[PDB]
Enzyme design. Sequence first.
Site, PDB file in Angstrom:
ATOM      1  N   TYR A   2       0.858  -1.195   0.000  1.00  0.00           N
ATOM      2  CA  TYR A   2       0.000   0.000   0.000  1.00  0.00           C
ATOM      3  C   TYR A   2       0.889   1.237   0.000  1.00  0.00           C
ATOM      4  O   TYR A   2       1.526   1.541   1.003  1.00  0.00           O
ATOM      5  CB  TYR A   2      -0.964  -0.052   1.193  1.00  0.00           C
ATOM      6  N   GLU A  39     -33.017  15.590 -14.899  1.00  0.00           N
ATOM      7  CA  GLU A  39     -31.870  16.518 -14.961  1.00  0.00           C
ATOM      8  C   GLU A  39     -31.914  17.397 -16.190  1.00  0.00           C
ATOM      9  O   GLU A  39     -31.663  18.611 -16.119  1.00  0.00           O
ATOM     10  CB  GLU A  39     -30.522  15.789 -14.920  1.00  0.00           C
ATOM     11  N   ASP A 102     -23.284  31.872  -9.931  1.00  0.00           N
ATOM     12  CA  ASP A 102     -23.553  33.264  -9.558  1.00  0.00           C
ATOM     13  C   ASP A 102     -24.987  33.526 -10.002  1.00  0.00           C
ATOM     14  O   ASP A 102     -25.652  32.597 -10.416  1.00  0.00           O
ATOM     15  CB  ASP A 102     -22.573  34.218 -10.243  1.00  0.00           C
ATOM     16  N   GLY A 114     -23.411  22.199 -11.057  1.00  0.00           N
ATOM     17  CA  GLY A 114     -22.630  22.092 -12.288  1.00  0.00           C
ATOM     18  C   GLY A 114     -22.290  20.653 -12.658  1.00  0.00           C
ATOM     19  O   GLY A 114     -21.222  20.361 -13.187  1.00  0.00           O
ATOM     20  N   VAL A 117     -26.096  17.468 -16.300  1.00  0.00           N
ATOM     21  CA  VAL A 117     -26.090  16.986 -17.669  1.00  0.00           C
ATOM     22  C   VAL A 117     -24.784  16.233 -18.001  1.00  0.00           C
ATOM     23  O   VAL A 117     -24.800  15.348 -18.855  1.00  0.00           O
ATOM     24  CB  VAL A 117     -26.425  18.112 -18.682  1.00  0.00           C
ATOM     25  N   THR A 328     -29.349  14.379  -6.201  1.00  0.00           N
ATOM     26  CA  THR A 328     -30.767  14.158  -6.517  1.00  0.00           C
ATOM     27  C   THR A 328     -31.726  15.120  -5.800  1.00  0.00           C
ATOM     28  O   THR A 328     -32.888  15.197  -6.176  1.00  0.00           O
ATOM     29  CB  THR A 328     -31.171  12.680  -6.342  1.00  0.00           C
TER      30      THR A 328
HETATM   31  N1  LIG Z   1      -6.162   6.941   8.149  1.00  0.00           N
HETATM   32  C1  LIG Z   1      -5.769   6.554   6.928  1.00  0.00           C
HETATM   33  N2  LIG Z   1      -4.828   5.587   6.831  1.00  0.00           N
HETATM   34  C2  LIG Z   1      -4.446   5.182   5.608  1.00  0.00           C
HETATM   35  N3  LIG Z   1      -4.876   5.592   4.417  1.00  0.00           N
HETATM   36  C3  LIG Z   1      -5.808   6.546   4.544  1.00  0.00           C
HETATM   37  C4  LIG Z   1      -6.288   7.084   5.731  1.00  0.00           C
HETATM   38  N4  LIG Z   1      -7.169   8.127   5.460  1.00  0.00           N
HETATM   39  C5  LIG Z   1      -7.210   8.178   4.150  1.00  0.00           C
HETATM   40  N5  LIG Z   1      -6.415   7.252   3.540  1.00  0.00           N
HETATM   41  C6  LIG Z   1      -6.226   7.104   2.105  1.00  0.00           C
HETATM   42  O1  LIG Z   1      -6.729   8.265   1.462  1.00  0.00           O
HETATM   43  C7  LIG Z   1      -7.715   7.873   0.475  1.00  0.00           C
HETATM   44  C8  LIG Z   1      -8.768   8.939   0.345  1.00  0.00           C
HETATM   45  O2  LIG Z   1      -9.532   9.007   1.565  1.00  0.00           O
HETATM   46  P1  LIG Z   1     -10.881   9.807   1.453  1.00  0.00           P
HETATM   47  O3  LIG Z   1     -10.815  11.225   0.811  1.00  0.00           O
HETATM   48  O4  LIG Z   1     -11.608   9.689   2.706  1.00  0.00           O
HETATM   49  O5  LIG Z   1     -11.692   8.947   0.382  1.00  0.00           O
HETATM   50  P2  LIG Z   1     -12.063   7.388   0.452  1.00  0.00           P
HETATM   51  O6  LIG Z   1     -11.890   6.900   1.920  1.00  0.00           O
HETATM   52  O7  LIG Z   1     -11.234   6.647  -0.488  1.00  0.00           O
HETATM   53  N6  LIG Z   1     -13.642   7.411   0.050  1.00  0.00           N
HETATM   54  P3  LIG Z   1     -14.833   8.292   0.746  1.00  0.00           P
HETATM   55  O8  LIG Z   1     -14.474   8.504   2.244  1.00  0.00           O
HETATM   56  O9  LIG Z   1     -16.151   7.458   0.684  1.00  0.00           O
HETATM   57  O10 LIG Z   1     -14.983   9.559   0.050  1.00  0.00           O
HETATM   58  C9  LIG Z   1      -8.220   6.516   0.952  1.00  0.00           C
HETATM   59  O11 LIG Z   1      -8.820   5.757  -0.101  1.00  0.00           O
HETATM   60  C10 LIG Z   1      -6.930   5.885   1.477  1.00  0.00           C
HETATM   61  O12 LIG Z   1      -6.179   5.389   0.375  1.00  0.00           O
HETATM   62  N1  LIG Z   2     -31.239  23.671 -21.694  1.00  0.00           N
HETATM   63  C1  LIG Z   2     -30.238  24.508 -21.393  1.00  0.00           C
HETATM   64  N2  LIG Z   2     -30.277  25.765 -21.890  1.00  0.00           N
HETATM   65  C2  LIG Z   2     -29.285  26.613 -21.575  1.00  0.00           C
HETATM   66  N3  LIG Z   2     -28.221  26.408 -20.801  1.00  0.00           N
HETATM   67  C3  LIG Z   2     -28.210  25.157 -20.321  1.00  0.00           C
HETATM   68  C4  LIG Z   2     -29.145  24.163 -20.574  1.00  0.00           C
HETATM   69  N4  LIG Z   2     -28.739  22.966 -19.990  1.00  0.00           N
HETATM   70  C5  LIG Z   2     -27.607  23.267 -19.399  1.00  0.00           C
HETATM   71  N5  LIG Z   2     -27.234  24.570 -19.559  1.00  0.00           N
HETATM   72  C6  LIG Z   2     -26.010  25.173 -19.057  1.00  0.00           C
HETATM   73  O1  LIG Z   2     -25.123  24.136 -18.667  1.00  0.00           O
HETATM   74  C7  LIG Z   2     -24.737  24.335 -17.285  1.00  0.00           C
HETATM   75  C8  LIG Z   2     -24.495  23.007 -16.620  1.00  0.00           C
HETATM   76  O2  LIG Z   2     -25.740  22.291 -16.515  1.00  0.00           O
HETATM   77  P1  LIG Z   2     -25.713  21.065 -15.531  1.00  0.00           P
HETATM   78  O3  LIG Z   2     -24.548  20.043 -15.700  1.00  0.00           O
HETATM   79  O4  LIG Z   2     -27.054  20.515 -15.420  1.00  0.00           O
HETATM   80  O5  LIG Z   2     -25.399  21.765 -14.133  1.00  0.00           O
HETATM   81  P2  LIG Z   2     -26.223  22.938 -13.414  1.00  0.00           P
HETATM   82  O6  LIG Z   2     -27.634  23.027 -14.065  1.00  0.00           O
HETATM   83  O7  LIG Z   2     -25.479  24.186 -13.511  1.00  0.00           O
HETATM   84  N6  LIG Z   2     -26.342  22.368 -11.892  1.00  0.00           N
HETATM   85  P3  LIG Z   2     -26.926  20.914 -11.417  1.00  0.00           P
HETATM   86  O8  LIG Z   2     -28.014  20.467 -12.435  1.00  0.00           O
HETATM   87  O9  LIG Z   2     -27.617  21.100 -10.030  1.00  0.00           O
HETATM   88  O10 LIG Z   2     -25.843  19.948 -11.337  1.00  0.00           O
HETATM   89  C9  LIG Z   2     -25.866  25.165 -16.685  1.00  0.00           C
HETATM   90  O11 LIG Z   2     -25.461  25.861 -15.502  1.00  0.00           O
HETATM   91  C10 LIG Z   2     -26.194  26.106 -17.843  1.00  0.00           C
HETATM   92  O12 LIG Z   2     -25.232  27.155 -17.871  1.00  0.00           O
HETATM   93 MG   LIG Z   3     -28.672  21.165 -14.153  1.00  0.00          MG
HETATM   94 NA    NA Z   4     -20.652  19.311 -16.188  1.00  0.00          NA
HETATM   95 NA    NA Z   5     -26.966  30.632  -8.893  1.00  0.00          NA
END
Ligand SMILES: Nc1ncnc2c1ncn2[C@@H]1O[C@H](COP(=O)(O)OP(=O)(O)NP(=O)(O)O)[C@@H](O)[C@H]1O
Ligand SMILES: Nc1ncnc2c1ncn2[C@@H]1O[C@H](COP(=O)(O)OP(=O)(O)NP(=O)(O)O)[C@@H](O)[C@H]1O
Ligand SMILES: [Mg+2]
Ligand code: NA
Ligand code: NA
EC number: 5.6.2.2
Lengths: 384, 384
Positions: A2, A39, A102, A114, A117, A328
């Site tokens: 590891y 979405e 914004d 963001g 889609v 969601t």
């Molecule tokens: N206490 C620890 N000891 C050893 N490795 C660790 C420890 N904390 C974190 N890691 C490592 O760091 C990685 C990232 O940790 P983290 O950001 O919490 O994401 P994750 O545990 O992989 N998944 P998640 O917690 O569900 O988002 C882990 O997958 C391990 O590889």
């Molecule tokens: N039908 C559309 N018409 C115009 N702009 C759009 C449309 N669909 C998406 N966009 C643009 O694409 C960006 C990203 O969309 P999306 O990945 O759904 O994320 P989001 O709407 O910003 N946030 P979220 O849906 O909560 O994850 C949006 O913020 C808009 O700027």
């Molecule tokens: Mg959206």
């Molecule tokens: Na995106």
């Molecule tokens: Na906003």
Amino acid sequence: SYDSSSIKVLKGLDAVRKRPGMYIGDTDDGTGLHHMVFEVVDNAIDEALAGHCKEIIVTIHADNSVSVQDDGRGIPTGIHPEEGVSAAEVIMTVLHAGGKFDDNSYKVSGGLHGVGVSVVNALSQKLELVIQREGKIHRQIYEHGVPQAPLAVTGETEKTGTMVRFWPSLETFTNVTEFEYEILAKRLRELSFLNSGVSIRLRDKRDGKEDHFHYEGGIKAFVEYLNKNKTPIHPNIFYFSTEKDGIGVEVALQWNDGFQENIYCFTNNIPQRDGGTHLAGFRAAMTRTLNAYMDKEGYSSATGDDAREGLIAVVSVKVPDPKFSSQTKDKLVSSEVKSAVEQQMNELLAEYLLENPTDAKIVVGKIIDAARAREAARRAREMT
Amino acid sequence: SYDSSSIKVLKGLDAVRKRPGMYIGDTDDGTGLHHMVFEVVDNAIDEALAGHCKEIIVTIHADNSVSVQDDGRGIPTGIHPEEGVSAAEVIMTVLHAGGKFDDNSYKVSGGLHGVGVSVVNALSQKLELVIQREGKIHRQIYEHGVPQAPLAVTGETEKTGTMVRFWPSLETFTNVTEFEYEILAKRLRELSFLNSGVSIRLRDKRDGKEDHFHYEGGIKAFVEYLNKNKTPIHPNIFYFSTEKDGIGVEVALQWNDGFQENIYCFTNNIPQRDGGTHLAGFRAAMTRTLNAYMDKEGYSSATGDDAREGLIAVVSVKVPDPKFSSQTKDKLVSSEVKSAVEQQMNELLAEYLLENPTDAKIVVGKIIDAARAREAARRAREMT
Ligand SMILES: Nc1ncnc2c1ncn2[C@@H]1O[C@H](COP(=O)(O)OP(=O)(O)NP(=O)(O)O)[C@@H](O)[C@H]1O
Ligand SMILES: Nc1ncnc2c1ncn2[C@@H]1O[C@H](COP(=O)(O)OP(=O)(O)NP(=O)(O)O)[C@@H](O)[C@H]1O
Ligand SMILES: [Mg+2]
Ligand code: NA
Ligand code: NA
Ligand SMILES: [Cl-]
Ligand SMILES: [Cl-]
Ligand SMILES: [Mg+2]
Ligand code: NA
Ligand code: NA
């Protein structure tokens, strides 16, 4: 062993495919599958909220793909100056990218992460994007999130809008793999009530079925619809819409002679199946205002639950930067929305009860009756 | 003007600070604040699940910071060959990075998204990281997620382990801003039951309070603990632990003379407050197995709810790649865990009832009594 080689960074959309639960939800029961559609729809509704889209068309195609066309502004097509590809492609291929960080492009929007889609793209075996904007039609195809060519101009147009069509990947989705008309229709009908003046159409090319949702009367009409197969016990639906301290609060409600509680909560038009701070604030104000009225009128012991029985309500809030526990958006976790809903409800419901004595007396009678039935049930249990 | 310049890409940890709800949950009621601790603890428990950590020490410091020390393998410190900085820094500063995207480093782990500790970092005004590994002590400081210097060796050691200390940012967290001993203690006590042989200590330097959790007897003892202030109605706790088709299923349960249902569900030791497919499979098998027994014995109408009354149960599953609806992992959305729990429960609960006739008869009596109280309550309501 590891070590540093054991640490992997997921790039692009690989995290969405690796861990779909945190982006789309359940990939086996059908809820995630339909959420892919929602979405896309939510982005079109956000153009409608911004004042730029008046028609949305959702089509279930005969090959089990779904398209959503809107007549909004169109996803921007110009080259993104930092990313070096079309802004549309940035949107499709990069997590935490968009125009909703914004309030310049959308004053209020259901979108905020963001992500949406790009998730639909990542979990689709194919996605077709057609954008109408600046006098031009632009098209791009993706496969499992990978663009097949740069966004290209394919012709001219006097129109503006976005069409997304996607074919969901069966490497992700299992069991419920076909779209269900009624699941889409329920959501679109609700969005029509919540968005007066927006024409929403649903077409199923499998069997020719179609609906056109363009209800008027908003959430008040929504309450009438919901109490349709039920028996309302008083004639005047309580309704208000206010905007205070940057938060919009719109409420409608009415009691029926049944025994369920059905409160529908929405934030920037997105439903919270698991409630939240808006639901918490609604409940608090109902309890306080009803108790105050019953105290003042000498009808007073009923709890929050007794007022809940037979209630249908719709709580719709508009918030600049709300907070959801998940992509969601099943639960609103914004404490200041609790205060706004509670405050507006307390003032306006108290006025409703003063202005509508016939209704107020019927509702008091109902609360008392629910409390009586609850105590009888408790006594009956204890005695078995 | 809505165009390519309106599309913003959030880099590094900026998305976590911009949208904390989807990464940590509620930032005002205290749940998110404590969740910061649990993310760090969950990583130490994952070293324990892997077989490498036997002691975890959680300290609430007098300046309202929390530290978590473990004696596991240590977060890798070598330079990441693709990223060009220490693997530890990659982990702290990049979303969707870690060692839990395959089963080489952790056969089973609560961790799966590669997000947790980068969230803690992003939402902390300060974070201190000390890693013991390969004969060396390594240290690094972050401020609002920004490393102040590259990870550095500061000395030598015969030990292995990770210590993370963080000071939560009040630009993110509001209202409940101090750590509550009992919230941490509840979770750590539970983890001790779920992880026999792992010493878990909690120290509060504000007032000198401390606990050492090292329960034996596992989830069976957990059920005894939970039924402590209650009145169990039969003497033999139902218990099993199996591993079939790559899924571990461990269940304990016992009925009491009260009227609540309390099922505690866990997946790779992480609690699902909002249940899931494991809870769904448990309920299904309970209903089927009890009905079959009552049918066969001629005691048969009770529904799933009547069997629920007075029940305390713990359902703990071990799954190679589970699916949660969110980073906070409140709900398990993996359909194959429903089938594994249902299948194992049906077989082993049926055997329990055959092997323990005294208990089986008491439980049948309880189910019948709950059904009787439910019908009396219904009749009493109808008659008011
Ligand atoms: N206490 C620890 N000891 C050893 N490795 C660790 C420890 N904390 C974190 N890691 C490592 O760091 C990685 C990232 O940790 P983290 O950001 O919490 O994401 P994750 O545990 O992989 N998944 P998640 O917690 O569900 O988002 C882990 O997958 C391990 O590889
Ligand atoms: N039908 C559309 N018409 C115009 N702009 C759009 C449309 N669909 C998406 N966009 C643009 O694409 C960006 C990203 O969309 P999306 O990945 O759904 O994320 P989001 O709407 O910003 N946030 P979220 O849906 O909560 O994850 C949006 O913020 C808009 O700027
Ligand atoms: Mg959206
Ligand atoms: Na995106
Ligand atoms: Na906003
Ligand atoms: Cl290393
Ligand atoms: Cl543009
Ligand atoms: Mg983790
Ligand atoms: Na990370
Ligand atoms: Na794994």
